[PDB]
Amino acid sequence: GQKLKDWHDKEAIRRDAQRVGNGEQGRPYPMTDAERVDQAYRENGFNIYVSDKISLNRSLPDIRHPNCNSKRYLETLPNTSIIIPFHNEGWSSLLRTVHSVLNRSPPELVAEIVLVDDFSDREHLKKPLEDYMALFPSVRILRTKKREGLIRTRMLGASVATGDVITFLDSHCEANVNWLPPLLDRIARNRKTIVCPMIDVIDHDDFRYETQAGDAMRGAFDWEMYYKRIPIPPELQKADPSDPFESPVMAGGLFAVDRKWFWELGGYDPGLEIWGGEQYEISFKVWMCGGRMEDIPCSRVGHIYRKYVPYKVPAGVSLARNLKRVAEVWMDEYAEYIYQRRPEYRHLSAGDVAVQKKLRSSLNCKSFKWFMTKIAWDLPKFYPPVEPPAAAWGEIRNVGTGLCADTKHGALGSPLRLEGCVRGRGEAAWNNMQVFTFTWREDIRPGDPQHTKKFCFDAISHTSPVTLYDCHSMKGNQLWKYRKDKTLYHPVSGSCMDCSESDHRIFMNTCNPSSLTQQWLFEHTNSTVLEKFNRN
Ligand SMILES: *[C@@H]1O[C@H](CO)[C@@H](O[C@@H]2O[C@H](CO)[C@@H](O)[C@H](O)[C@H]2NC(C)=O)[C@H](O)[C@H]1NC(C)=O
Numbered sequence: 001g002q003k004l005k006d007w008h009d010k011e012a013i014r015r016d017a018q019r020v021g022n023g024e025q026g027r028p029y030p031m032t033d034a035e036r037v038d039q040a041y042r043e044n045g046f047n048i049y050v051s052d053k054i055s056l057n058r059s060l061p062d063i064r065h066p067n068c069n070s071k072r073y074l075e076t077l078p079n080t081s082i083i084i085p086f087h088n089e090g091w092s093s094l095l096r097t098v099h100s101v102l103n104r105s106p107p108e109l110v111a112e113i114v115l116v117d118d119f120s121d122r123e124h125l126k127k128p129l130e131d132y133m134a135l136f137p138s139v140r141i142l143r144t145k146k147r148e149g150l151i152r153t154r155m156l157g158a159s160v161a162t163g164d165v166i167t168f169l170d171s172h173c174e175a176n177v178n179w180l181p182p183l184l185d186r187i188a189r190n191r192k193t194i195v196c197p198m199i200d201v202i203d204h205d206d207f208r209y210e211t212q213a214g215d216a217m218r219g220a221f222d223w224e225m226y227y228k229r230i231p232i233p234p235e236l237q238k239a240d241p242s243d244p245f246e247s248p249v250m251a252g253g254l255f256a257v258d259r260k261w262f263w264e265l266g267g268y269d270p271g272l273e274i275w276g277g278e279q280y281e282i283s284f285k286v287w288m289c290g291g292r293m294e295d296i297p298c299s300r301v302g303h304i305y306r307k308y309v310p311y312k313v314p315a316g317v318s319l320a321r322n323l324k325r326v327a328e329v330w331m332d333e334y335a336e337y338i339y340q341r342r343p344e345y346r347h348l349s350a351g352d353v354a355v356q357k358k359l360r361s362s363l364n365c366k367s368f369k370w371f372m373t374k375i376a377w378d379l380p381k382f383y384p385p386v387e388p389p390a391a392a393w394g395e396i397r398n399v400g401t402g403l404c405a406d407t408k409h410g411a412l413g414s415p416l417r418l419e420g421c422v423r424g425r426g427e428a429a430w431n432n433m434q435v436f437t438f439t440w441r442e443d444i445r446p447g448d449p450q451h452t453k454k455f456c457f458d459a460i461s462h463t464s465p466v467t468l469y470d471c472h473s474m475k476g477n478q479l480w481k482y483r484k485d486k487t488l489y490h491p492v493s494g495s496c497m498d499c500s501e502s503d504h505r506i507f508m509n510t511c512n513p514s515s516l517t518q519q520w521l522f523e524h525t526n527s528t529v530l531e532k533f534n535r536n
């Protein structure tokens with residue numbers, strides 16, 4: 001019998017809505033010079049002074065899709081073991097995670113909450129934590145005998161879980177309203193599906209709660225294996241935008257997976273060290289070996305992204321080794337695409353993978369080719385295994401002032417000023433960066449077309465100066481056009497690039513294929529590409 005149910009705790013929603021105080025409803029914390037010190041970050045990578053001044057039960061805004069409130073799920077669902085690994089995690093941030101789980105998860109559906117201590121040295125994580133958690137029956141603390149790392153530490157928790165499905169959560173999260181039922185329901189219908197809630201951001205400074213940019217998006221990666229998020233192609237967008245949707249890769253820290261299914265895949269590669277790579281291993285595993293992976297818009301959990309890594313990592317440990325172990329076992333021929341960018345990965349021992357490779361074959365999995373072609377088919381659109389050639393690169397000299405486009409190596413956000421051309425015959429004492437590349441993405445970024453920087457030419461209005469704002473693979477305000485009239489057309493602003501003849505900064509203005517201050521010249525080119533997106 002599929003007797004459904006409305007798992008919403010209307011009263012709790014009312015009481016949470018009626019809650020008042022600093023940080024309530026997810027609003028930012030009223031920052032003061034006291035909380036703005038640098039010692040407030042030293043321990044966690046996020047503001048612990050602010051965290052301490054916010055209630056461990058603070059309320060959060062319900063930013064779910066309007067349809068989510070209407071959804072209903074199976075009256076009978078499988079119970080879950082919530083595993084939370086931690087290492088020298090802050091006191092309040094950890095307690096807020098557990099409270100959110102306790103107060104926003106139907107007790108009946110929670111078999112147990114297991115906090116797994118990864119050899120923590122912070123004192124508040126010892127007796128105090130124990131006495132405090134002893135007051136909550138469903139909570140249990142498990143400790144490793146030495147530093148094991150998040151991967152193995154999550155494995156420890158998984159090896160003891162008694163619930164039907166294992167739900168993983170980082171130690172600095174905050175479950176939002178009615179987040180668990182929609183995850184359990186999905187796995188109840190498809191045991192081999194791994195599910196991920198939408199991961200929302202909890203600001204490391206004022207702790208405000210808000211969705212990541214772009215909201216519902218597909219997971220992916222660049223060829224250096226940095227996690228990326230790309231938009232859902234129109235042909236994949238569900239009728240009801242609140243419905244479960246496929247994701248090729250998970251962020252890694254928040255997901256639920258049937259316990260039995262989890263071990264059938266072999267959990268995680270025990271060889272993965274402190275951080276990195278397990279998200280790729282497990283994601284490739286679920287798809288390639290018979291399962292699936294889905295993001296559940298109706299389930300949302302806040303997560304605090306660190307401003308920097310506080311803990312320490314043992315000697316002789318790098319992300320490279322983890323990644324290498326993942327590439328060799330599951331990435332087939334695509335692993336090569338990784339080495340062509342990071343050559344040290346070739347003659348770099350990835351340890352013994354024999355055991356792992358044995359796992360893959362015993363599962364009868366598809367090729368990684370299959371994964372790239374049928375699952376992550378949109379990934380190469382933003383991160384092509386082999387990047388198309390650039391249109392133009394070199395120095396950008398303005399016909400008018402005769403000067404060159406330069407930048408005082410201002411990576412943050414210093415306008416694209418104008419300086420006397422160096423041409424490689426200059427002194428590095430004056431700090432001259434006059435090399436640029438008009439990449440295949442129709443954007444302009446400093447450096448050689450082979451050693452470009454993640455900084456693009458971003459312009460707001462049709463008069464503001466150019467900027468080296470972070471590059472976002474979107475033809476937004478980083479979309480340029482180099483026409484035969486020697487001008488850098490900005491379609492999203494309808495204006496062109498100009499510069500004050502009085503030897504001043506470079507700023508947008510009214511286009512004019514007759515002016516000299518708007519006429520630019522690159523050192524090299526490839527008209528075959530300049531004829532690409534210049535016509536409709
Ligand atoms: C904040 O959350 C905690 C953790 O759930 C609350 O403490 C528990 O509240 C429930 C009520 O649903 C009781 O059944 C438990 O016995 C409480 N735990 C213990 C041992 O005290 C706490 O009351 C909440 N505080 C606020 C602001 O409501």
Ligand SMILES: O=c1ccn([C@@H]2O[C@H](COP(=O)(O)OP(=O)(O)O)[C@@H](O)[C@H]2O)c(=O)[nH]1
Pocket residue numbers: 084085086087088089117118148149150153169170171172253274275305306311
């Ligand atoms: O050696 C480690 C490092 C991290 N963690 C925990 O694993 C989770 C994920 O790590 P982290 O938050 O540092 O990764 P991030 O989200 O920043 O990428 C957190 O709960 C950490 O406390 C752990 O148990 N052992």
Ligand SMILES: CC(=O)N[C@@H]1[C@@H](O)[C@@H](O)[C@@H](CO)O[C@H]1O
Pocket residue numbers: 150170199227250251252253254274275276277278279303
């Ligand atoms: C919010 C989130 O998913 N964080 C994860 C982190 O928990 C860990 O899995 C890391 C790889 O070690 O990847 C991150 O993206």
Ligand SMILES: *[C@@H]1O[C@H](CO)[C@@H](O)[C@H](O)[C@H]1NC(C)=O
Pocket residue numbers: 388389526528529
């Ligand atoms: C531009 O020139 C390069 C030579 O480096 C060539 O390989 C490329 O095909 C040209 N542009 C395109 C994509 O046609």
Ligand SMILES: *[C@H]1O[C@H](CO)[C@@H](O)[C@H](O)[C@H]1NC(C)=O
Pocket residue numbers: 078079110111112162163164
């Ligand atoms: C959850 O219920 C299942 C039976 O459906 C049982 O196997 C499991 O042990 C329960 N979890 C708890 C509370 O131990």
Ligand SMILES: [Mn+2]
Pocket residue numbers: 170171172253303304305
């Ligand atoms: Mn984290």
